[PDB]
């Protein structure tokens, strides 16, 4: 009950892989076996399978959230009904994945969404993958089992994951869920790999300071204040900052922080603050630039991304877009026009499609791999993307 204090390390995970390979059954099995062995609340298949709608970045996704504990860590776990839900969750970052559990049915081996989820995992920055080789109660041989293991390792290595070093558990989500002790032990083995193989993620407060600028105003004879929600890290009074994006990078010092009309010695991740800057004039700083720890973020104009285009039902476009489409790219607190390069042999992108897009913005913005953005056009949200590779 001390767990109400939430002092144990927290890790965000999820089940990925092809439809019907056993992702929901495994999720229910993990909660049930861990509840029996260590204490917790068990969750049934139907509760997880009936995923509620949740809105991401203007996009509706069906996502089920569960939580479970191991003796040393707390897990928040996501599971989704359809492939489209995984596409949207992964691109928008709506569900954080510090690690993923790739579920592969031993009976079918890797399938088209198995490959797609590994590929997207790499592009969106999912740092670690552990494999649960499912339906092993249906495969009594070893030649097919060692073969599927080999194919999974090669597939992971094809997309730069370390296939040779990947933990692969051979189990049966159904039989463990049904209470068979031999198969429940394979669930404990999986949870042991969550503990040992996925490192404790870095908390936003421990990352280098970043604040996306919203409002800018002057305090007569004291300097310019910029407002925003601290995205990550901490800014302290007396620390130096870089002002990155849109214009040439500038340097300044934090001389004050205020929140709810209270003067503070610091601004922390998630706080809606105002930051007073030394020797910066009101006209020299604007919305869409970021305040950041010096040397930790650079401005870029060109990048590779993975983008999901909203369907008609999600309130997106009714018709496809083509090469020549020059829409607005929404980065943190501003929008910027960009020119797009589609993949070789692609002339149109239908509503509901996801594709790799190479974008060139009209001016630079502060960005790193993993930064999310929206695509908007007169005057609605038509897409959502993630920066896969900064090009310059």
């Amino acid at each position: 009950k001390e767990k109400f204090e939430r002092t144990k390390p927290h890790v965000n995970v999820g089940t990925i892989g092809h439809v019907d390979h056993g992702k929901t059954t495994l999720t229910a099995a993990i909660t049930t076996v861990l509840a029996k062995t260590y204490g917790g609340a068990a969750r049934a298949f139907d509760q997880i399978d009936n995923a509620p709608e949740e809105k991401a970045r203007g996009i509706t996704i069906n996502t089920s959230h569960v939580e479970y504990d191991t003796p040393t860590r707390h897990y928040a776990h996501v599971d989704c009904p359809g492939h489209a839900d995984y596409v949207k969750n992964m691109i928008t970052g709506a569900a954080q994945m510090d690690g993923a559990i790739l579920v592969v049915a031993a009976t079918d081996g890797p399938m088209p969404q198995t490959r797609e989820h590994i590929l997207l995992g790499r592009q969106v920055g999912v740092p670690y993958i552990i494999v649960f080789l499912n339906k092993c109660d249906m495969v009594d041989d070893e030649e097919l089992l060692e073969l599927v293991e080999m194919e999974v390792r090669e597939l992971l290595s094809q997309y730069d994951f370390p296939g040779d070093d990947t933990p692969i558990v051979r189990g049966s989500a159904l039989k463990a869920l049904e209470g068979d002790a031999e198969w429940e032990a394979k669930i404990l083995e999986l949870a042991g790999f969550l503990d040992s193989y996925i490192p404790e993620p870095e908390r936003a407060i421990d990352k280098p300071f970043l604040l996306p600028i919203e409002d800018v105003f002057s305090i007569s004879g004291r300097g310019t204040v910029v407002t925003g929600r601290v995205e990550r890290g901490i800014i302290k009074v007396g620390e130096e900052v870089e002002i990155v994006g849109i214009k040439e990078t500038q340097k300044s010092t934090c001389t004050g922080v205020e929140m709810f009309r209270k003067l503070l010695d610091e601004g922390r991740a998630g706080e809606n603050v105002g930051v007073l800057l030394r020797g910066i004039k009101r006209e020299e700083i604007e919305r869409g630039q970021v305040l950041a720890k010096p040397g930790t973020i650079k401005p870029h104009t060109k990048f590779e991304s993975e983008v999901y285009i909203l369907s008609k039902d999600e309130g997106g476009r009714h018709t496809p877009f083509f090469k020549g489409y020059r829409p607005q790219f929404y980065f943190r607190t501003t929008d910027v026009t960009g020119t797009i390069e589609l993949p070789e042999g692609v002339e149109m992108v239908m509503p509901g499609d996801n594709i790799k897009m190479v974008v060139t913005l009209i001016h630079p913005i502060a960005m790193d791999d993993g930064l999310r953005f929206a695509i908007r056009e007169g005057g609605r949200t038509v897409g959502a993307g993630v920066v896969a590779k900064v090009l310059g």
Binding site: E214, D215, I219, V225, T227, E258, R261, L263, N272
Partner: peptide
């Protein structure tokens, strides 16, 4: 600054 519970705003001096 200029806020008070949670909307954008500030001050600094």
């Amino acid at each position: 600054s200029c806020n008070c519970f949670c909307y954008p705003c500030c001050s600094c001096x």
